UniProtKB/Swiss-Prot annotation, chain A:
Identification of the protein by name: Large ribosomal subunit protein bL27
Subunit structure: Part of the 50S ribosomal subunit. Cross-links to the 23S rRNA. Cross-links to the A and P site tRNAs.
Keyword Cell membrane annotated: no
Record organism: Escherichia coli (strain K12)
Gene3D superfamilies linked to this entry: 2.40.50.100
Alphabetical UniProt keywords: Ribonucleoprotein, Ribosomal protein, RNA-binding, rRNA-binding, tRNA-binding
Curated annotation (Swiss-Prot), chain B:
Pfam assignment, any one: Ribosomal_L18p
CC per GO annotation: cytoplasm; cytosol; cytosolic large ribosomal subunit
Xref: InterPro entries: Ribosomal_uL18_bac-type, Ribosomal_uL18_bac/euk
Biological role: This is one of the proteins that mediates the attachment of the 5S rRNA subcomplex onto the large ribosomal subunit where it forms part of the central protuberance. Binds stably to 5S rRNA; increases binding abilities of L5 in a cooperative fashion; both proteins together confer 23S rRNA binding. The 5S rRNA and some of its associated proteins might help stabilize positioning of ribosome-bound tRNAs.
Organism expressing this protein natively: Escherichia coli (strain K12)
GO biological process terms, semicolon-separated: cytoplasmic translation
Key word DNA-binding present: no
Region (Required for binding of the 5S rRNA/L5/L18 complex to the 23S rRNA): 1-16
NCBIfam families: L18_bact
Record's protein name: Large ribosomal subunit protein uL18
Keywords, ordered alphabetically: Phosphoprotein, Ribonucleoprotein, Ribosomal protein, RNA-binding, rRNA-binding
Assembly and binders: Part of the 50S ribosomal subunit; part of the 5S rRNA/L5/L18/L25 subcomplex. Contacts the 5S and 23S rRNAs.
Modifications made to the protein after synthesis: The protein has been shown to contain a phosphoserine, which was required for the protein to bind to 5S rRNA. However, the presence of this phosphoserine is controversial, and it has not been seen by mass spectrometry.
Swiss-Prot record, chain C:
Gene designation per UniProt: rplP
HAMAP family, alphabetized: Ribosomal_uL16
A GO term from the CC aspect: cytosolic large ribosomal subunit
Residue(s) carrying (3R)-3-hydroxyarginine: 81
Post-translational modification: Is hydroxylated on Arg-81 by RoxA. The modification is nearly suppressed when E.coli is grown in anoxia.
Protein name listed in UniProt: Large ribosomal subunit protein uL16
Protein family per UniProt: Belongs to the universal ribosomal protein uL16 family.
Residue list for modification N-methylmethionine: 1
GO molecular function: rRNA binding; structural constituent of ribosome; tRNA binding
Gene Ontology biological process terms from the UniProt entry: cytoplasmic translation; ribosomal large subunit assembly
A Pfam family recorded for this sequence: Ribosomal_L16
Species of origin: Escherichia coli (strain K12)
UniProtKB/Swiss-Prot annotation, chain D:
Something else known: Surface exposed on the 50S subunit.
GO CC terms, sorted: cytoplasm; cytosol; cytosolic large ribosomal subunit
Protein name (record): Large ribosomal subunit protein bL33
Keyword Ribonucleoprotein: yes
Top-rank taxon, per record: Bacteria
Any Pfam family the entry gives: Ribosomal_L33
Length: 75, 116, 136, 50, 64
RNA sequence: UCCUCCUAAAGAGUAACGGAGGAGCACGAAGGUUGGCUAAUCCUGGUCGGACAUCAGGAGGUUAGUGCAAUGGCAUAAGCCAGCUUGACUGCGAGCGUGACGGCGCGAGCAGGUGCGAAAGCAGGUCAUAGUGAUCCGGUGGUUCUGAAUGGAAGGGCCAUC
């Protein structure tokens, strides 16, 4: 009675650390918030992370819970 | 714990101001000697501070830690900030209800030039 | 007939038996039977070997079983075409890698221990050897 | 799908309307939301209707 | 005989200056209550025919 | 047909009559904002009351909860309570993700007019991911856009919707 499946949602990181992006570009597609928005990064209703400014994207770990953050520096 | 509850209360506001990147007027209230501080957006340096703990401001008001004290400190921060140059700031409750002394300090500050 | 209780899933993938054994040392008794070859032992084989030693030692000493099946195996019924879903679970097997200690034992002389293990190994499908508890 | 669709008609003379859904079994009374009417470019009261 | 235009195609595609074709979006006819205003708003303007199916459109209406 | 996990070999994708489960909704509030709060499970004392109602204290730190299966996420709580409310708004939309295509998804910002707050600010539905059906034909309301001699009308077109 098996045989059912769902179409893959093509999640994952779209832009990796150290590459320039344009404002509004999608950086990470995720179900929850595995990565939290940092500086110049906005979070969508579906927890999508997009660039709010033009620059280089970088990843880092911050906070007491060592949770991962994505930031953008104007470079 | 009173402190733990207060920090938890103000964490969301502090984070919101931090990511917004704007100078914030932070006020600390106690049974005596209400404090006030102006913090740069990075959060690493204090632009200017005032309070009723120093004799320069504690030599006039009858008692520190009342409505009159809050107005004096709220006023005191004003001309200091205006003299420094910074005009616009974001008020931070720091987990204190914006009802009594905190409101009086803010009301004195806003009417003294630090509109926000 | 060792078998788990209320396992999470009825069926599981075939997998592979690559790698190397972890429980390679005697931990409970003073003598043990180490696995030299690689393969899988069914629940029936484990029961048969256990009965052989208990009779050999005449219920003297202690017996430790260091392997549990915890892996169902299916088998299609005779005269059944390929497909139409996974087969039904038939028996449970334990994957054995070289160096795995199968049974442990204590409370008997070394001489009597050797024959007891030899009888058990005669009813197992994998090459085995006799080992003694080491000091550290 | 017991929930059924309704029409919200602006209190102004304009014919603009909104469309939504509601459950008549639980909340049989009318709906009086205050929404924006672009024909007059003002926020007005919208009444439920068929 | 001269080629016959596909009349159904001629009622759904209009030719543009650079040889492209504009068509109406195909999800704004009915069942509109459950749709977000954002999706309905974006479907209102006319859109250009994709490259892959452009060749099919050319054959359907060789005259227009 | 659609959703979640595994198979799937640490980007994405990836088959089988392979292994497990769900959906064809619900909610004018379960939405928006402002203010406040922080579980499960155990130990001790206490009427009915008893292993398991409610009260007090202690260990515990989220094993709780999150309208609905699963995964990811959630203390700044996305979890729980209350006040005021309709941003579940209109016209757009830089720039991206995803598809052979039809299409689907995210979105800063601008104009108009609103709600909450002293304010910075938040709000273009709901913690996210299922709750859905192209085109044709026809119905309803608005709009002189058109209306085949002229002035109208019928019928079409455009917009909203069935």
């Amino acid at each position: 009675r098996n045989g059912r499946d769902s179409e893959a949602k093509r999640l994952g990181v779209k832009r990796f650390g150290g590459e320039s992006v344009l404002a509004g570009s999608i950086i990470v597609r995720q179900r929850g918030t595995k990565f939290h928005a940092g500086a110049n990064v906005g979070c969508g209703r579906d927890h999508t992370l997009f660039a709010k400014a033009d620059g280089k994207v970088k990843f880092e770990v911050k906070g007491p819970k060592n949770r991962k953050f994505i930031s953008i520096e104007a470079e | 714990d009173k402190k733990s509850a207060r920090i938890r209360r103000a964490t969301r506001a502090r984070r919101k101001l931090q990511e917004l990147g704007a100078t914030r007027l932070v006020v600390h209230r106690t049974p005596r000697h209400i404090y006030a501080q102006v913090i740069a957006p990075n959060g690493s340096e204090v632009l200017v501070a005032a309070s009723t703990v120093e004799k320069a401001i504690a030599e006039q008001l009858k008692y520190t830690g009342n409505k009159d004290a809050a107005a004096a400190v709220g006023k005191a921060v004003a001309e200091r900030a205006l003299e420094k140059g910074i005009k616009d700031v974001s008020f931070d409750r720091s987990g204190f209800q914006y009802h009594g002394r905190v409101q009086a300090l803010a009301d004195a500050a806003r009417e003294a030039g630090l509109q926000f | 007939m060792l078998q788990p209780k209320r396992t999470k899933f009825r069926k599981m993938h075939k997998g592979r038996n690559r790698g190397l054994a972890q429980g390679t040392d005697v931990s409970f008794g003073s003598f043990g039977l180490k696995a030299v070859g690689r393969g899988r032992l069914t629940a029936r084989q484990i029961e048969a070997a256990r009965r052989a030693m208990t009779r050999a030692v005449k219920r003297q000493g202690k017996i430790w079983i260091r392997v549990f099946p915890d892996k169902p195996i299916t088998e299609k019924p005779l005269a059944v075409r390929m497909g139409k879903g996974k087969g039904n679970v038939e028996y449970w097997v334990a994957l054995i890698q070289p160096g795995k200690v199968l049974y442990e034992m204590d409370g008997v002389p070394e001489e009597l221990a050797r024959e007891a293990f030899k009888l058990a190994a005669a009813k197992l499908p994998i090459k085995t050897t006799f080992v003694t508890k080491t000091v550290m | 799908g017991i929930r059924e669709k309704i029409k919200l008609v602006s209190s102004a003379g304009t014919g603009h309307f909104y469309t939504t859904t509601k459950n008549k079994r639980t909340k049989p009374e009318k709906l009086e939301l205050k929404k924006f009417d672009p024909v007059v470019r003002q926020h007005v009261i919208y009444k439920e209707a068929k | 005989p001269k080629i016959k235009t596909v009349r159904g195609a001629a009622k759904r595609f209009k030719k543009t200056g650079k040889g492209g074709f504009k068509h109406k979006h195909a999800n704004l006819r009915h069942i509109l209550t459950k749709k977000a205003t954002k999706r309905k708003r974006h479907l209102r303007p006319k859109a250009m025919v994709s490259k892959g199916d452009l060749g099919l459109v050319i054959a359907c209406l060789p005259y227009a």
